[PDB]
Amino acid sequence: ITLKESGLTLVRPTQTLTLTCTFSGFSLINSGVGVGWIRQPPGKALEWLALIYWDDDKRYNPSLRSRLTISKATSKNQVVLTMTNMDPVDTATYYCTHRGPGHNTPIYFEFWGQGALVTVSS
Amino acid sequence: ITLKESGLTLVRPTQTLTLTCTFSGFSLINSGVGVGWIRQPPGKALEWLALIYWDDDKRYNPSLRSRLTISKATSKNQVVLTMTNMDPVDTATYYCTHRGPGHNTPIYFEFWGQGALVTVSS
Amino acid sequence: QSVLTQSPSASGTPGQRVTISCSGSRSNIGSNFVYWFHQLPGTAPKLLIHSNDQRPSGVPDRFSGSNSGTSASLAISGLRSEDEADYYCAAWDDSLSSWVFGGGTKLTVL
Amino acid sequence: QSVLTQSPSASGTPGQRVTISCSGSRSNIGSNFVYWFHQLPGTAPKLLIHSNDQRPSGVPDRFSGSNSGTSASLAISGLRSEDEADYYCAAWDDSLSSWVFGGGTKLTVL
Amino acid sequence: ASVYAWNRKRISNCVADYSVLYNFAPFFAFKCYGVSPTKLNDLCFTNVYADSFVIRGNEVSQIAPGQTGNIADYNYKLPDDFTGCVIAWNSNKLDSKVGGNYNYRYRLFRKSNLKPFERDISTEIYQAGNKPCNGVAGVNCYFPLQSYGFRPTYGVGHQPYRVVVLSFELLHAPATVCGPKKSTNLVKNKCVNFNFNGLTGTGVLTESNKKFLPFQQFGRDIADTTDAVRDPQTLEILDITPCSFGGV
């Protein structure tokens, strides 16, 4: 099971970020499966961004709500994240993660992408 | 519970001492039980020689180590003590004593033998 | 209440057992499952214990987790030299309705 | 350090209480049990008090023991004429790893 | 025995009597999982194991299902589906030598935790970051077993306790061991309710005159009416006749 993020890594402030996690080994049509996004500043603790279940239940981080849009393209086996109004504090690494079933409870963040360092500057 | 010492009481210097404590009322196979030896010069204080627990832990007096060998003969319900290179300063009385269990802590030297005056001269 | 707090350093020594604490609140850690991650530098983290006591397949036995009321603990047995890395808490907070994480602990063996 | 020291004489008088001291060191009397024996002329000794406060079955009540730091005391009440004999200390010294004894006290009643 | 090499024993084909345990000691620890101690003396099991060993004071709490510790992790583990009882009592009277009893040892280092009811005795030198030294000191290269060091002055938290664990089994049991089934003195010539080795009925008992063969225990007249029975204690044959009844 593999995930990988991609997109533009450098953007000026006040612009929007788009990222696409392409995966292989699971489909967002089975039961259970869902995909989320998690960012981490350089040298800080983790932070949770957004999540999208298989029946399209788009849970969001409230403090970052009103800024984020996550959507799926199941045919292409890929998920898209978008965040408007970038600022210099949002320079961070963004991982795309997976939640599938376990043995008596759902597993969360069992598998990770490999990150995509995003710098916001000029 | 009874103990009794026996052996040769008089020996010249540069010879070896042998003593045999035959006992009755306890066995060196139970837990707790142990047997020891204590010598006392004429008109002086006591001195500890050796000790042998039920699991065969042959503790010795360090300063008198390299000279002493204590062993048990459980089949005959008797213990043998041996000390080589006797000298006139080793003239004393030798008691064989018993260490059994108490009520919250092991008892030591509760019962004594009757001594065996040992003279080292010519 | 809404942020988990971990002590920053553990500092064991090989073949020893150490514990890492995590204090939460009545609302997130005391009424939800507690995850436990680990991230050597320059690498995505990797799950160690989900559901407070279960290990994803591929983790040695020596890692154990525990949740009790409003507290959490990770027990590492057989401390080794390949375990000096960051350890993170994770729990879902109903009052904030989001996943929250802790600070992290160093855990450098001697 | 490696030898317990007792006063050679006690010298009470009938129906009186007398004390016998026993000085040890940080290594033996302050960290082990203190025994107290009583040897009469021409006879093997006889236990009086083990574990600093317990009496083997068959010793009168008047004998009392006390341990304090690195010193030891035996308390005899109702002093009588049948008690003039030698009294010895004994304790295990971890530093020497052997049993060690004291000098002895006279305790002659008048 | 020492805890890392505990000693199992089997008990079967007996009339187990549990009324001897209480008279042993004040029983610093006596707790039972899956059974009650007072209702213990009447049920029957297939095979009863007894596991005895010696541990420290503050570790008696580890002998319980699902507890991770150090002796319940490396040298004695019992299942989460346990059924039996544990009994531990302080025995500082008999195990504490002056100067230290370095005869009770325990496993301190192991590669992985052990399966329930598993015992290991090998005393091989433990692994280190790099290839171990050789039963000697080094960067790690430690040695597994460690002594205890019991002394008479230690607190009641580091004093030696003797502990014995009883394990039962109950499934599809051609039962081998139950409790004692107490009996009562015989009454003759009176309408009495009787229970002879399972045969229950009522009637007056009278001395018999018929010769039972030595392997027979019951007697029947025509139409299955139990007419006679032999006493299971003294083997005398006894006659059964129903006490008087009739219409008025």
Name the residue with tokens 């978008």: A82
Distance CA A49, CA A35 (A): 11
Contact call for C14 and E109, based on CB within 8 A? no
Name the residue with tokens 């010492």: B5
Contact call for E142 and C17, based on CB within 8 A? no
D46 contacts B112 by C-beta, under 8 angstroms: yes
Domains delineated in chain A? 2-120 (2.60.40.10)
Contact status of E103 with chain B (Cβ, < 8 Å): yes
Phi–psi pair at B41, nearest 5 degrees: -65, 170
Phi–psi pair at E54, nearest 5 degrees: -135, 130
Elucidation method: cryo-EM
Among residues E76, E61, E84, E96, which one has the least CA distance to residue E170?
Answer: E84
| Residue C88 CA neighbour count, 13 Å, CB half | 23
Distance CA E11, CA E177 (A): 8
Q: Which residues of C99-109 are buried (b: 16+ CB within 10 A; e: fewer)?
A: bbbbbbbebeb
Query: Which residues have a Cβ under 8 Å from the Cβ of E23 and sit 6 or more positions away?
Result: none
Q: List the end-to-end C-alpha distance of chain A, in Å, as a whole number.
A: 37
Structure tokens at D24: 């040890």
Q: Which residues of E22-47 are buried (b: 16+ CB within 10 A; e: fewer)?
A: eeeeeebeeebeebeeeebeeeebee
Locate all alpha helices (DSSP H) within chain C, ordered by sequence: none
- CB-closest option in E93, E98, E99 to B102: E93
Which residue in D has a C-alpha nearest to residue E153's C-alpha?
D32
B72-to-B39, B83, E130 alpha-carbon distances in Å: 19, 15, 46
Query: Which residues have a Cβ under 8 Å from the Cβ of E198 and sit 6 or more positions away?
Result: none
Contact call for E126 and C15, based on CB within 8 A? yes
Distance CA C37, CA A40 (A): 14
Question: Which residues, listed in sequence order, are joined to residue A99 by a DSSP beta bridge?
Answer: A34
E10-to-E7, E41, E166, E171 alpha-carbon distances in Å: 10, 18, 10, 17
Max CA-CA distance within chain B? Answer: 49
B100 contacts B33 by C-beta, under 8 angstroms: yes
E127-to-E109, E111, E137 alpha-carbon distances in Å: 9, 8, 12
A96 contacts A109 by C-beta, under 8 angstroms: no
Domain extents in chain D? 5-101
B99 contacts B107 by C-beta, under 8 angstroms: yes
Structure tokens at B120: 């080292």
Distance CA D24, CA D106 (A): 19
The DSSP letter of residue E38 is G
Distance CA E51, CA E49 (A): 7
D to E CB pairs, distance under 8 Å: 11
- Please tell me which chains touch A, using 3 or more CB pairs under 8 Å as the contact test: C
The dihedral of CA E203, E204, E208, E212: what is its sign?
A: positive
Contact call for C35 and A109, based on CB within 8 A? yes
- CB-closest option in B55, B104, B108 to E92: B104
Distance CA D41, CA E45 (A): 65
User: Residue A109's CB: how many other CB atoms inside 10 A?
Assistant: 22
SS3 C7: coil
- CB-closest option in A62, A103, A108 to C98: A62
A110 contacts A99 by C-beta, under 8 angstroms: yes
Instruction: Provide the CATH number for the domain formed by D5-101 in this structure.
Output: 2.60.40.10
B102 contacts D39 by C-beta, under 8 angstroms: no
Structure tokens at E110: 């192991």
A50 contacts A59 by C-beta, under 8 angstroms: yes
- Please tell me which chains touch C, using 3 or more CB pairs under 8 Å as the contact test: A, E
Contact call for B48 and D98, based on CB within 8 A? yes
Question: Which residues, listed in sequence order, are joined to residue B118 by a DSSP beta bridge?
Answer: B92
User: Residue E168's CB: how many other CB atoms inside 10 A?
Assistant: 21
The DSSP letter of residue E150 is B
Q: H-helix or E-strand containing E199?
A: strand E199-207
Question: Which residues, listed in sequence order, are joined to residue E63 by a DSSP beta bridge?
Answer: none
E236 contacts E208 by C-beta, under 8 angstroms: yes
Query: Which residues have a Cβ under 8 Å from the Cβ of E204 and sit 6 or more positions away?
Result: E188, E189, E190, E191, E192, E240, E241, E243
D104 torsion bin: left (phi>0), alpha (psi -120 to 50), beta (else): left
- CB-closest option in B53, B102, B104 to E97: B53
Distance CA C44, CA C38 (A): 9
Smallest Cα distance from B114 to chain D, Å: 6
Smallest Cα distance from D56 to chain E, Å: 14
Query: Which residues have a Cβ under 8 Å from the Cβ of E236 and sit 6 or more positions away?
Result: E207, E208, E230
Among residues B3, B60, B54, which one has the least CA distance to residue B32?
Answer: B54
Header resolution in angstroms: 3.4
| Residue E140 CA from chain centroid, whole number | 42
DSSP output for chain A? -EEE--B--EE-TT--EEEEEEEES--TTSSS-EEEEEEE-TTS--EEEEEE-TT--EEE-GGGTTTEEEEEEGGGTEEEEEE-S--GGG-EEEEEEEE---SSS---S-EE----EEEE--
B46 contacts B40 by C-beta, under 8 angstroms: yes
